[PDB]
């Protein structure tokens, strides 16, 4: 009834306290999202400008955003009107509102992936295991129509049919697009997405340890220095006789 | 003897003491910064955009 | 009486340089302070940063 | 049956206030009666109790204790305040009762 | 007249007369450094707080995204958000040790200093609570719903009291704006009362580990304790920053990454770590009002401590039995926290009721009893 | 206000102290410091540790026992057809 | 004067005038297949509409109506024995029962 | 001891700064602005909070929130008023409080 399989712990290149994200793997992750997931999954808090200097060149980013139609307005007659995207636009929502999103996924609501790796226990370890973990239901388990069996998803019946399969796309950087190769990449992306600071946050953490180390020491001496007066202190009771 | 040279010239006069802290903090910064960034970037070879960069930066078209 | 009163032995705690009862403690002062003040000067620099 | 004795002496070493050289009475928390009692202590008994305490505090700041030899012994602990305090508390109960009458 | 301008000036005479020429026992241990840390937190929280308030937007349709924007766009916003949220935790860690110390060393015999303390604790709790509601995430919402619903246990004026709380007839925008107002305000009331806390203190002076008058040996706060506190600061600061910088979300529930849904209560709904122990007790009593009362009492019981003191000595330094009981109590809370983080199913439910029953007995019955006992063993 | 001068009445106590610049900051780290760190650890570890170690078990138990109750007992379906 | 000024300020917290007092909601019993529960947004908090199988309709009517915290028989709680409708709000402290 | 008005660390304050306070027997009405100024502060602060509980700091919502605060919030309109006009009477009062000081050399 309340049984569940927990995902394992893969050794991500960005797992270390001092390990930055592999920006090469993130550029790919993006491609995966852009050409596969963005079909049902929104990413409301990221924007084309965010890719600049992280995974793409300014040229690239701008063209990447001009590949989309963006509603704007009103004009002079208070009329909405399409237009090409600017680097300041947010990634395109594939549905106008949840109601319609469910309406085209069997009533299932594909969550916005912006903060996903932090909204699910397991983070990328989970997301990964789930993407690559689809399989056949065991003896005695009947999966409702329209649903799929995944042991990693709580309830084992997930509404998302396996999104990735070998060569489903082609990394223009020449990396063998096997299935786990993809999943591995897109997960690395969903991390960068849920927290762009990541890299800088750790570079700081480094500086913090060094100064913290050096400083705690200096002050420990100074504290002992002053206190010595009281530490060495000697007293005697010489009542008069 | 630096300790004496330093004490006599820097640490004695509470006014020169301050100049040392400022002048020092400035040097300390500029260096501690490079060093750390240098340690960090090294620990992450080929992963930062600083590295990938050359592949698309004015290399194509 | 105050004549029978003497300052105990602080050898267990004295700095190496002022351990000998027959050497002017004055020569090593400049250092003893320069070092302690250098630790403080640094703490200030580390904090200032 | 020396049981109560056996126990008391145990608890006494358990407490450990003797490791600082304090008599069982130097540890009493100073409420109103204790304060009065102490004012009735003879000059010398008060000056000794003071040193014992000022010495125990100095130990505590240093994070040390007395060398085993100098520890107070369960049977050599002088209850220097106990009798004064009991009178203070007896004088007080009289007043208290007399004001209800 | 007054020679120095440190003892006469109507103001500096204060900075000096309450933190520089202040008489401090020479033997206060590290357990006394929490006062300042608590103080420092307050200023740090307040500061990082304002910085955030300058980007937040109290409105259901905009709360969640404002915070999100505050992080992804505001320069260093992400860092400030972290510091503010993790300060909340280190604030509670510190306050808990601050309390333990008081308990273990009978500082509660300083009644007013103590009672204002308890008031402080309750205020900090209320504050941290409403802060946690501002980002309007899943916990934010359901937390807001359950806690305001607590008044519903008060007969008559109950169901009404809930109406104000919400400003409507179900959590919504008004609740979120009057919560932001409330959060913005309380911290100051905290800072205010803190001043009184410290003022009552000053009448008597600090207590010390051996619990015997330290008049025979006082020392000037500065440089003894000012330096000791600077150090005590750089120590707490290290793991606080190691945590906030290397593992940001370690200490926090993830449900709050999902915008509030008025129709779905997450199945794994827990409160922030520092409230678990109470949440644990609430889930013990299987009756609406009983659980509520037990919860209230789980904190309000602090007001009774001063009155349940039977030992003839002040601290537990020389009371080995009280010590064991004291540490047995700590492990006792440590358990309730674990329980609070587990589902309402066996064996937990039973272990739960136990630890609770255990909590209230060690405080109302045991301590005062073992205390009396100990007095007899000293022959008093 | 001022409390330095009222505090208490003390007589016959001499105290000698040395400036900080004449002595060592952290002296006898081995012969004195560590020995006491150990001294203290010992005296206290048996009043503190016990109850913690105790709660630990209760934690490990209740945890593993909640897991056991998840697994199935064959004796339920060894009659089914 | 005082009582009156408090009267006012205190009701400045109550529900405003814009807070409604709305209508109903229609639902097709053909969207809710047998053996399932469904949630509809309504008057603020959730609203359940459950199509019960008779496999259940028996349990709910076969219980000690005297050993209940709140004693009521499944029959006078619902009209059609296959459709149980209720406000999805725990009566304890307001969370939504799963 | 004796009275709990002069010893208590708190009441000794309410009493030592507004009840046993030594006041010249001839201060005129131009001395009443101190308290009025004070009273304003508390009144402003109070009505202010009440409003902050319905305001929404955002360009696309500031104006309409104040408008809503008045037309919908019970007695909101009154509170809005009191707060806005208190701002004025506060200034009036502070101006007389200043003149008084100027005309009677209190600036000494
Ligand atoms: C550096 C820490 C000191 C190391 C130590 O244990 O000293 C033993 C020893 C000194 O021996 P000692 O004089 O007998 O010790 C007495 C004091 O404990 C000597 O210690 P102290 O009195 O000089 O220093 C006190 C200090 C000691 O710091 C600690 O206990 C740690 O504690 C504080 O200042 C309080 C700050 C606590 C902050 C924690 C924040 C809460 C977050 C929780 C998550 O130092 C060494 O062995 C040398 C190490 C270099
Ligand atoms: C409430 C929810 C809080 C969540 C749980 C957090 C608990 C964290 C884990 C326990 C941390 C305690 C660290 C152990 C320190 C061990 C130690 O040093 O013990 C010995 C040492 C020596 O004793 P003395 O006789 O004074 O020495 C002088 C003569 N030689 O004892 C002490 O340090 C004194 C006790 C310090 C208090 C620490 C208690 C921990 C905090 C718990 C909160 C308890 C209060 C209830 C709050 C209700 C809300
Ligand atoms: C439903 C109907 C509404 C009910 C209202 C709630 C009831 C409130 C309880 C009233 C109980 C009053 C008790 C006071 C008795 C104390 C006392 O000693 O008398 C007053 C005592 C004076 O004593 P004596 O007259 O010299 O002699 C005593 C006779 N043996 O104190 C005084 O100076 C009283 C002065 C009263 C007027 C001051 C207030 C005027 C202020 C102006 C602004 C007012 C409006 C704004 C209020 C809004 C606040 C948010
Ligand atoms: C056909 C639309 C579609 C595509 C394409 C798709 N997903 Fe989904 N995804 C869904 C649906 C529907 C759900 C909701 C499942 C549910 O809750 O029943 C979902 C849910 C998820 C969840 C986990 C939800 C949870 O509750 O744990 C993740 C993570 C996710 N998808 C990731 C991806 C990734 C990564 C890709 C791209 C490689 C992808 N999806 C592509 C439809 C899709
Ligand atoms: C805003 C919260 C608080 C702050 C900032 C604060 C601050 C202070 C400060 C700075 C001290 C002096 C130094 C010290 O001895 O630690 C102190 C002492 C004290 N506080 Fe607090 N405190 C807070 C909460 C509490 C709480 C919750 C209690 C009660 C449960 C409490 C009980 C005490 C007591 C009893 C003293 C005297 C300590 C002694 O015996 O030496 N405080 N507090
Ligand atoms: C008593 C000191 C304070 C405590 C205990 C505290 C605690 C909190 C908590 C627990 C949160 C939720 C953090 C999260 O997990 O996202 C929070 C958020 C916030 N607090 Fe505070 N806060 C304090 C003071 C302040 C003050 C005075 C301000 C501003 C002047 C402030 C403004 C906010 C804002 C805007 C947020 C919401 C957005 C966010 O979470 O980043 N806080 N506070
Ligand atoms: C928040 C603003 C202020 C408040 C609430 C306030 C309040 C007070 C109060 C209650 C008094 C005592 C009674 C009285 O003599 O009026 C006082 C006195 C005084 N205030 Fe202000 N004040 C404020 C602003 C100012 C300003 C703007 C000035 C200076 C330009 C000023 C100058 C004085 C002086 C000189 C006194 C002594 C009056 C005397 O000679 O009797 N005050 N103030
Ligand atoms: C120094 C005392 C105060 C003064 C001088 C003051 C003054 C003002 C002024 C001039 C306005 C514009 C009024 C208008 O609509 O014409 C205003 C509005 C407002 N104030 Fe204050 N205020 C004070 C205290 C407060 C505080 C502390 C709060 C809340 C805790 C507050 C909250 C607001 C809000 C929400 C508004 C904007 C909406 C409105 O105008 O009704 N005020 N205040
Ligand atoms: C809040 C504080 C100290 C704060 C700082 C801010 C100083 C004013 C300057 C240097 C620092 O950085 C300290 C942390 C001390 C609180 C404080 C007290 O109020 C009192 Cl009565 C005592 C007896 C102590 C004893 O340790 C104490 O720590
Ligand atoms: C810990 C607690 C309440 C604590 C208060 C109410 C004290 C009893 C008094 C002072 C305060 O302000 C605290 C917030 C309630 C338990 C509690 C929570 O905290 C939270 Cl966040 C949630 C989401 C639930 C859900 O069921 C809960 O039961
Ligand atoms: C702010 C105030 C009084 C306020 C109230 C609020 C009292 C506390 C209780 C009764 C009232 O209603 C007064 C208006 C007085 C200010 C005030 C002062 O601070 C001082 Cl030093 C003086 C010498 C005066 C002389 O007249 C004064 O009026
Ligand atoms: C007490 C511990 C203090 C730690 C101080 C570390 C200061 C953080 O240093 C930060 O490093 C970043 C990356 O290198 C830079 O981008 C920031 O501008 C810089 O402020
Ligand atoms: S069990 Fe408490 S709200 Fe449902």
Structural domain containing residue E333: 1-380
Closest-CA distance, B29 to chain C, in angstroms, reads 7
Show the tokens assigned to B16.
Answer: 């020169």
Query: Which sign does the torsion angle of CA E223, E228, E229, E234 carry?
Result: positive
Show the tokens assigned to E215.
Answer: 């008049």
Tell me, using a 6 A CB cutoff, whether residue F36 lines ligand 1: yes
Show the tokens assigned to H65.
Answer: 């929130």
Q: Distance between CA C3 and CA C5 in Å, rounded?
A: 5
Residues 6+ apart with CB under 8 A from D54: A235, E216, E217, F10, F13
Catalytic positions of E are: 202, 206, 228-229, 272
Element housing D53 (H / E): helix D43-62
Show the tokens assigned to E311.
Answer: 């030992």
Q: In 3D, which of A8, A23, A1 has the Cα closest to residue A188? A: A23
Residues 6+ apart with CB under 8 A from G61: G73, G74, G75
Tell me, using a 6 A CB cutoff, whether residue H13 lines ligand 11: no
Domain count, chain D: 1
Question: Searching chain F, which residue's CA lies closest to the CA of residue E320?
Answer: F47
Name all residues whose Cβ lies below 6 A of ligand 10. Answer: E 122, 125-126, 129, 139, 142-143, 146-147, 269, 271, 275, 278-279, 282, 295-296, 299
- Would you call A233 and D54 a contact, using CB atoms and an 8 Å cutoff? no
Radius of gyration of chain A (CA): 27
CA-CA-CA-CA dihedral for A112, A113, A119, A120, to nearest 10 = 110
Q: Is A81 helix (H, G, I), strand (E, B) or coil?
A: strand
E230 contacts in A (CB within 8 Å)?
219, 223
Tell me the CA distances in angstroms from F26 to A220, A221, A229, E33, F20, one per residue in order. 10, 8, 12, 21, 11
- State yes or no: G90 annotated in a binding site: yes
Q: Check CB contact of F58 with chain C, cutoff 8 Å.
A: no
Q: In 3D, which of A41, A93, A45 has the Cα closest to residue A69? A: A93
The rounded Cα D58 to chain-centroid distance in angstroms is 18
Best residue among E62, E131, E189 to mutate for probing ligand 6's pocket (most ligand atoms within 8 Å of CB) is E131
- Would you call E58 and H54 a contact, using CB atoms and an 8 Å cutoff? no
Question: How was this structure obtained?
Answer: X-ray
Tell me, using a 6 A CB cutoff, whether residue H89 lines ligand 8: no
Backbone angles phi, psi at B13, to 5 degrees: -70, 110
Helices (H), chain E: 12-17, 34-53, 63-72, 77-104, 111-133, 138-149, 157-166, 173-204, 221-246, 276-282, 288-300, 320-340, 348-361, 367-378
Residues 6+ apart with CB under 8 A from A84: A65, A66, A68, A69, A70
Q: Distance between CA H82 and CA H70 in Å, rounded?
A: 12
The protein residue whose alpha carbon is closest to atom 13 in ligand 11 is H35
Backbone angles phi, psi at E26, to 5 degrees: -75, -15
The protein residue whose alpha carbon is closest to atom 24 in ligand 5 is E117
Q: Which of A215, A221, A238 sits opposite C47 (nearest CB)?
A: A215
Q: Which of F12, F15, F70 sits opposite A233 (nearest CB)?
A: F15
Q: Are F79 and E358 in contact (CB under 8 A)?
A: no
Domain count, chain E: 1
Which residues pair with residue G48 across a beta bridge? G39, G86
Query: Which sign does the torsion angle of CA H26, H32, H35, H38 carry?
Result: negative
Q: Are G38 and G60 in contact (CB under 8 A)?
A: no
Show the tokens assigned to E69.
Answer: 């924007």
Q: In 3D, which of E326, E58, E92 has the Cα closest to residue E174? A: E58
Show the tokens assigned to C13.
Answer: 């705690």
- Identify the CATH number of the domain defined by range G19-98: 2.102.10.10
Q: Distance between CA E103 and CA E34 in Å, rounded?
A: 14
Q: Say which residue the tokens 């301050």 belong to.
A: B18
Q: Distance between CA A202 and CA A194 in Å, rounded?
A: 15
> How many CB atoms lie under 10 A from the CB of residue A46?
20
The protein residue whose alpha carbon is closest to atom 39 in ligand 1 is E236
- Would you call C36 and F20 a contact, using CB atoms and an 8 Å cutoff? yes
**Which CATH number characterizes residue B47's domain?**
1.20.5.260
Q: Which of B4, B24, B32 sits opposite C30 (nearest CB)?
A: B4
Structural domain containing residue F30: 1-81
Q: Check CB contact of E113 with chain H, cutoff 8 Å.
A: no
The rounded Cα A107 to chain-centroid distance in angstroms is 25
A97-104 long-range contacts (CB < 8 A, ≥24 apart) are: A101/A40, A104/A40
Q: Are A168 and A108 in contact (CB under 8 A)?
A: no
Q: What is the resolution of this structure in A?
A: 3.2
Q: Is G66 helix (H, G, I), strand (E, B) or coil?
A: coil
The protein residue whose alpha carbon is closest to atom 29 in ligand 1 is E30
Tell me, using a 6 A CB cutoff, whether residue E36 lines ligand 9: yes
Q: Distance between CA C13 and CA A228 in Å, rounded?
A: 9
Question: Searching chain A, which residue's CA lies closest to the CA of residue C41?
Answer: A218
Q: In 3D, which of D46, D56, D31 has the Cα closest to residue D81? A: D46
The rounded Cα E27 to chain-centroid distance in angstroms is 26
Q: Say which residue the tokens 């005296």 belong to.
A: F43
Which residues pair with residue E98 across a beta bridge? none
Domain count, chain A: 2
- Would you call A23 and B40 a contact, using CB atoms and an 8 Å cutoff? no
Q: Check CB contact of B29 with chain C, cutoff 8 Å.
A: yes
Closest-CA distance, A218 to chain C, in angstroms, reads 6
Q: Distance between CA E125 and CA E117 in Å, rounded?
A: 12
Residues A39 and A141 in one domain: yes
Structural domain containing residue A236: 197-241
Tell me the CA distances in angstroms from E236 to E38, E80, E229, E330, one per residue in order. 11, 18, 10, 21
Q: Say which residue the tokens 């007080």 belong to.
A: D92
Q: Check CB contact of H54 with chain E, cutoff 8 Å.
A: yes
Chains D and G touch (3+ CB pairs under 8 A): no
**Which CATH number characterizes residue E217's domain?**
1.20.810.10
Does residue A106 come out as left (phi exceeding 0), alpha (psi in the -120 to 50 range) or beta?
A: left
**Which CATH number characterizes residue A222's domain?**
1.20.5.100
Residues A160 and A132 in one domain: yes
Tell me, using a 6 A CB cutoff, whether residue G95 lines ligand 13: yes
First to last CA, chain D: 45
**Which CATH number characterizes residue D71's domain?**
1.10.1090.10
G13 contacts in H (CB within 8 Å)?
53
Residues A223 and A121 in one domain: no
Q: Are G85 and G49 in contact (CB under 8 A)?
A: yes
Residues A188 and A207 in one domain: no
Q: What CATH architecture is C1-49?
A: Up-down Bundle (1.20)
Q: What distance in angstroms lies between residue E196's CA and the mean position of ligand 5's atoms? A: 11
Residues A209 and A144 in one domain: no
F20 contacts in C (CB within 8 Å)?
36
């Amino acid at each position: 009834g309340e049984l569940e399989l927990h995902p394992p712990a893969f050794p991500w290149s960005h797992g270390g306290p001092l390990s930055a994200l592999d920006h090469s793997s993130v550029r790919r992750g993006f491609q995966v999202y852009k050409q596969v997931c963005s079909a049902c999954h929104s990413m409301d808090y990221v924007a084309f400008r965010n890719l600049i200097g992280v995974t793409h060149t300014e040229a690239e980013a701008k063209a990447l955003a001009e590949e989309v139609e963006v509603q704007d307005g009103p004009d002079e007659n208070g009329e909405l009107f399409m237009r090409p995207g600017k680097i300041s636009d947010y990634f395109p929502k594939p549905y106008p509102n949840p109601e319609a999103a469910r309406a085209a996924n069997n009533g299932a609501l594909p969550p916005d992936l912006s903060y996903i790796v932090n909204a699910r226990h397991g983070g990328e370890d989970y997301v990964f295991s789930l993407l690559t973990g689809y399989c056949d239901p065991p003896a005695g388990v009947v999966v409702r129509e329209g649903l799929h069996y995944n042991p990693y998803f709580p309830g084992q019946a997930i509404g998302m049919a396996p999104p990735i399969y070998n060569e489903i796309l082609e990394y223009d950087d020449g990396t063998p697009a096997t299935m786990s190769q993809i999943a591995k990449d897109v997960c690395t992306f969903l991390r960068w997405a849920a927290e762009p600071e990541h890299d800088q946050r750790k570079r700081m953490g480094l500086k913090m340890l060094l100064i913290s180390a050096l400083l705690t020491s200096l002050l420990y001496y100074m504290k002992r220095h002053k206190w010595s007066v009281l530490k060495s202190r000697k007293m005697a009771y010489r009542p008069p006789k | 003897a630096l300790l004496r040279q330093a004490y006599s010239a820097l640490f004695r006069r509470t006014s020169t003491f301050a100049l040392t802290v400022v002048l020092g903090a400035v040097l300390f910064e500029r260096a501690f910064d490079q060093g750390a960034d240098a340690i960090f970037e090294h620990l992450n070879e080929g992963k930062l955009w600083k590295h990938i960069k050359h592949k698309y930066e004015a290399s194509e078209e | 009486v105050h004549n029978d009163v003497t300052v105990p032995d602080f050898s267990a705690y004295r700095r190496e340089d002022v351990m000998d009862a027959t050497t002017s403690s004055q020569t090593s002062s400049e250092d003893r302070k320069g070092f302690s003040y250098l630790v403080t000067a640094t703490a200030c620099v580390a904090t200032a940063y | 049956g020396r049981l109560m004795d056996r126990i008391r002496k145990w608890y006494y070493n358990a407490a450990g206030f003797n490791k600082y050289g304090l008599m069982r009475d130097d540890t009493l928390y100073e409420d109103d009666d204790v304060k009065e009692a102490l004012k009735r202590l003879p000059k010398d008994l008060y000056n000794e109790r003071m040193f014992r305490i000022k010495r125990a505090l100095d130990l505590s700041l240093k994070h040390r204790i007395l060398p085993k030899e100098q520890w107070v012994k369960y049977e050599e602990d002088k209850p220097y305040l106990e009798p004064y305090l009991k009178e203070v508390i007896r004088e007080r109960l009289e007043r208290e009762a007399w004001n209800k009458k | 007249m007054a020679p120095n301008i440190r003892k006469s000036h109507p103001l500096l005479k204060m900075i000096n007369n309450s933190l520089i020429d202040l008489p401090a026992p020479s033997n206060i241990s590290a357990w006394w450094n929490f006062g300042s840390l608590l103080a420092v937190c307050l200023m740090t929280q307040i500061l990082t707080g304002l910085l955030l308030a300058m980007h937040y937007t109290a409105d259901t349709s905009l709360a969640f995204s404002s915070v999100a924007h505050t992080c992804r766009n505001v320069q260093y916003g992400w860092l400030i958000r972290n510091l503010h949220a993790n300060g909340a935790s280190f604030f509670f860690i510190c306050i808990f040790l601050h309390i333990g110390r008081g308990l273990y060393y009978g500082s509660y015999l300083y009644k007013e200093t103590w009672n204002t303390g308890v008031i402080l604790l309750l205020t900090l709790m209320a504050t941290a609570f409403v802060g946690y509601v501002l980002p309007w995430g899943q916990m934010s919402f359901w937390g807001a719903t359950v806690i305001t619903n607590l008044f519903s246990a008060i007969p008559y004026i109950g169901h009404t009291l809930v109406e104000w709380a919400w400003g409507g007839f179900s959590v919504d925008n008004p609740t979120l704006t009057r919560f932001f107002a409330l959060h913005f305000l309380l911290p100051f009331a905290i800072a205010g009362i803190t001043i009184i806390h410290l003022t009552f203190l000053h009448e008597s002076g600090s207590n010390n580990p051996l619990g015997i008058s330290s008049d025979s040996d006082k020392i000037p706060f500065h440089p003894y304790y000012s330096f000791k506190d600077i150090l005590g600061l750089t120590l707490m600061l290290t793991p606080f920053l190691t945590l906030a910088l290397f593992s940001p979300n370690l200490l926090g529930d993830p449900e709050n990454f999902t915008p509030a849904n008025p129709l779905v209560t997450p199945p794994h709904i827990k409160p922030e770590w520092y409230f678990l122990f109470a949440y644990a007790i609430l889930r013990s009593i299987p009756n609406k009002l009983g659980g509520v009362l037990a919860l209230a009492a789980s904190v309000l019981i602090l007001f009774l401590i001063p009155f349940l003191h039977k030992s003839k000595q002040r601290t537990m330094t020389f009371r080995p039995l009280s010590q064991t009981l004291f540490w047995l109590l700590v492990a006792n809370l440590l358990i309730l926290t674990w329980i609070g983080s587990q589902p309402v199913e066996h064996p937990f439910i039973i272990i739960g009721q136990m630890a609770s029953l255990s909590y209230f007995t060690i405080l109302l019955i045991l301590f005062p009893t073992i205390g009396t006992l100990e007095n007899k063993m000293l022959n008093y | 206000g001022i409390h330095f001068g009222n505090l208490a009445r003390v007589r016959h106590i001499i105290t000698y102290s040395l400036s900080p610049f004449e002595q060592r900051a952290i002296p006898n780290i081995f012969s004195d410091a560590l020995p006491n760190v150990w001294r203290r650890f010992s005296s206290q570890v048996f009043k503190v540790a016990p109850p913690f170690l105790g709660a630990y078990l209760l934690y490990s138990w209740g945890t593993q026992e909640f897991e056991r109750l998840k697994r199935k007992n064959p004796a339920d379906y060894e009659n089914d057809q | 004067a005082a009582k009156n000024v408090v009267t006012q300020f205190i009701s400045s917290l109550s529900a405003s005038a814009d807070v409604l007092a709305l209508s109903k909601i229609e639902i097709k019993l053909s969207d809710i297949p047998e053996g399932k529960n469904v949630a509809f947004k309504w008057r603020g908090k959730p609203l359940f509409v459950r199509h019960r199988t008779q496999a259940e309709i028996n349990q709910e009517a076969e219980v000690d109506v005297s050993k209940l915290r709140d004693p009521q028989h499944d029959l006078d709680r619902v009209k059609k024995p296959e459709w149980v409708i209720l406000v999805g709000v725990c009566t304890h402290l307001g969370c939504v029962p799963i």
